[PDB]
């Protein structure tokens, strides 16, 4: 996971942000996607960042 010469890195944020703005999610999380490190970093963050939106 993570791998820099394979697009499935990509793919796997593009996904996750797509996701998170389906739910309402601002830029300030959706960054944290793009700025993850790998994919395992990705699906973790994206749940988390749920976890907050649903969080009340």
């Given at each position: 996971?993570?791998?820099?010469?394979?697009?499935?890195?990509?793919?796997?944020?593009?996904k996750?942000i797509?996701?998170?703005?389906?739910?309402?999610?601002?830029?300030?999380?959706?960054?944290?996607?793009?700025?993850?490190?790998?994919?395992?970093?990705?699906?973790?963050?994206?749940?988390?960042?749920?976890?907050?939106?649903?969080?009340?």
């Amino acid at each position: 996971n993570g791998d820099k010469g394979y697009n499935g890195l990509a793919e796997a944020k593009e996904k996750a942000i797509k996701d998170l703005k389906i739910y309402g999610i601002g830029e300030h999380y959706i960054k944290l996607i793009e700025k993850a490190k790998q994919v395992a970093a990705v699906e973790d963050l994206k749940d988390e960042i749920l976890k907050a939106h649903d969080r009340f």
